[PDB]
From Swiss-Prot:
Function description: High molecular weight cytoskeletal protein concentrated at regions of cell-matrix and cell-cell contacts. Involved in connections of major cytoskeletal structures to the plasma membrane. With KANK1 co-organize the assembly of cortical microtubule stabilizing complexes (CMSCs) positioned to control microtubule-actin crosstalk at focal adhesions (FAs) rims.
Record note on quaternary structure: Part of a complex composed of THSD1, PTK2/FAK1, TLN1 and VCL. Interacts with THSD1; this promotes interaction with PTK2/FAK1 and VCL. Interacts with NRAP and LAYN. Interacts with SYNM. Interacts with ITGB1; the interaction is prevented by competitive binding of ITGB1BP1. Binds with high affinity to VCL and with low affinity to integrins. Interacts with APBB1IP; this inhibits VCL binding. Interacts with PTK2/FAK1. Interacts with PIP5K1C. Interacts with F-actin. Interacts with SVEP1.
Protein's gene: Tln1
Residue ranges that the Swiss-Prot or TrEMBL entry lists as coiled coil: none
The record's note on its domains: Consists of an N-terminal FERM domain linked via a short unstructured region to a large flexible C-terminal rod which contains 13 amphipathic helical bundles (R1-R13). The rod begins with a five-helix bundle (R1) followed by three four-helix bundles (R2-R4). These are followed by a series of eight five-helix bundles (R5-R7 and R9-R13) in which the N- and C-termini are positioned at opposite ends of the bundle, creating a linear chain. The four-helix bundle R8 does not disrupt the chain because it is inserted into a loop in the R7 five-helix bundle.
Species name: Mus musculus (Mouse)
Protein name: Talin-1
Lineage of the species this protein comes from: Eukaryota, Metazoa, Chordata, Craniata, Vertebrata
Length: 189
């Protein structure tokens, strides 16, 4: 945090928190989404908006937990001094830091775009193509953020334990979101 050398790895932590805040804000907007649910004569199998609402939050919660876990795993390496958390060796860590940082903005954008895709779905503009495509991008981008943490960090670390599970949840939730999107689409095969 407040280190006397502004180590590049710590610089990344700040960026990860910034990304987290951005994701959690989208997650917040996700909770502000009112589904097409009214006490009227609408007995259909179309609770799509709700099935998306839950899963959007499942991603939102998992994604935010993931980026915070990345920061955690990274920070563990910083505290121990096993990553390159020294400006004099920043040539090595800086490329890991920027790699993690860029990947985080990748997951941030992907997960944010999914928020926009879900935003349409909940409100009535059901776009299975947009939703599924973005979900696969979310899962791929976000789960790859774990791959970046697999670099430098050890997998059996508890910070990584939480990290791995959170990233897995993104893929799992995105799958479910895809599955649910398929329900609101007519693909007779």
């Amino acid at each position: 945090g407040i280190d006397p050398f502004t180590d590049p790895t710590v610089i990344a932590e700040n960026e990860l928190l910034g990304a987290a805040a951005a994701i959690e804000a989208a997650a917040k907007k996700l909770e502000q989404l009112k589904p097409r649910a009214k006490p009227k004569e609408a007995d259909e199998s179309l609770n799509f908006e709700e099935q998306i609402l839950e899963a959007a939050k499942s991603i939102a919660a998992a994604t935010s937990a993931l980026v915070k876990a990345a920061s955690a795993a990274q920070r563990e390496l910083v505290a121990q001094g096993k990553v390159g958390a020294i400006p004099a060796n920043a040539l090595d860590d800086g490329q890991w830091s920027q790699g993690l940082i860029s990947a985080a903005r990748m997951v941030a954008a992907a997960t944010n775009n999914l928020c926009e895709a879900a935003n349409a779905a909940v409100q009535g503009h059901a776009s299975q193509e947009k939703l599924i495509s973005s979900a696969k991008q979310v899962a791929a981008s976000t789960a790859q953020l774990l791959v970046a943490c697999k670099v430098k960090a050890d997998q059996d670390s508890e910070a990584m334990k939480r990290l791995q599970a959170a990233g897995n949840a993104v893929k799992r939730a995105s799958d479910n979101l895809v599955k649910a999107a398929q329900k609101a689409a007519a693909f007779e095969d």
